[PDB]
């Protein structure tokens, strides 16, 4: 139903090792479709999903030029950050930015985003109204006044309401076979003895898309939030994802425990138990 497009910029200074490096990636939902690396011998925006390849030379040339311009801008932004924080030119620092649009089920703009960070901490963010900014510290307030004076938020709002939604909707249609068809998880429960008196029950969810999923363990219908070990959702490398949840149970109580799986790909939520004689 809902969909999103996000661009992620990373700019990192490397004093004494070369000029600052700029890396950009673009995502539609959980699918990466473009990349740019200033460290490449011939830097260009490159396809990373099959449905983006149909775009013309005008698209790749325009994207590459914009990425080249952005790399130069963030090279200067890194120097500006040194002034605001009174930092030496010998240290390594990172600026990050993520921006994009969220589309509602009706296919229209639901929310726009534009956030920036310095050394992994919030710096400045565009507010939900797409007209004002929130600055994290006094240095970012210097940037906020410059952006207010230069009417940056109106430029962001025009992009987020217009080109961002238009390009995202185009990608969703061109890649509808993969982007708009959810892959349900393949699920099973495994049992691992820890001792003669205790065992781990592990609930698996494999090969699902998109990444959002809910895995919970229940004991006699009661969620075991505190005692559940939950690993981060992880990529399988084929554009689908994996996750598991585990709980340690007394030997002989295993059948009291149920694993519950919620995913967009499933018609109904799943309820699983250890079934050794499957």
């Amino acid at each position: 139903g809902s969909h999103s497009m996000r661009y992620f910029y990373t700019a990192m200074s490397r004093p004494g090792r070369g000029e600052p490096r700029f890396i950009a990636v673009g995502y539609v939902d959980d699918t990466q479709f473009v990349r740019f690396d200033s460290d490449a011998a011939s830097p260009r925006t490159e396809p990373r999903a099959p449905w983006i390849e149909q775009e013309g030379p005008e698209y790749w040339d325009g994207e590459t030029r914009n990425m080249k311009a952005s790399a130069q801008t963030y090279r200067e932004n890194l120097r500006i950050a040194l002034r605001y924080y009174n930092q030496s030119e010998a240290g390594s620092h990172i600026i990050q930015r993520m921006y994009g649009c969220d589309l509602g089920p009706d296919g229209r703009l639901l929310r726009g985003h534009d956030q920036s960070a310095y050394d992994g901490k919030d710096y400045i963010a565009l507010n939900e109204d797409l007209s004002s900014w929130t600055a994290a510290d006094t240095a970012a307030q210097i940037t906020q006044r410059k952006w207010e004076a230069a009417r940056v938020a109106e430029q962001l709002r025009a992009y987020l309401e217009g080109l961002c939604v238009e390009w995202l909707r185009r990608y969703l249609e061109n890649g509808k076979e993969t982007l708009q068809r959810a892959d349900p998880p393949k699920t099973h429960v495994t049992h691992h003895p820890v001792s003669d008196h205790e065992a781990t029950l592990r609930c698996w969810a494999l090969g699902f898309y998109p990444a959002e999923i809910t895995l919970t363990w229940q004991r006699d219908g009661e969620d075991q939030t505190q005692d559940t070990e939950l690993v981060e959702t992880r990529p399988a490398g084929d554009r689908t994802f994996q996750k598991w949840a585990a709980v340690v149970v007394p030997s002989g109580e295993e059948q009291r425990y149920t694993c519950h799986v919620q995913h967009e790909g499933l018609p109904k939520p799943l309820t699983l138990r250890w079934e050794p004689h499957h």
């Binding site: 994207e63 932004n77 950050a81 921006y99 992009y159 080109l163």
Partner: peptide, 10 residues
């Protein structure tokens, strides 16, 4: 462009 064309500094 798909990406944000705009450039203004910090």
């Amino acid at each position: 462009t798909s990406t944000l064309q705009e450039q203004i500094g910090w």
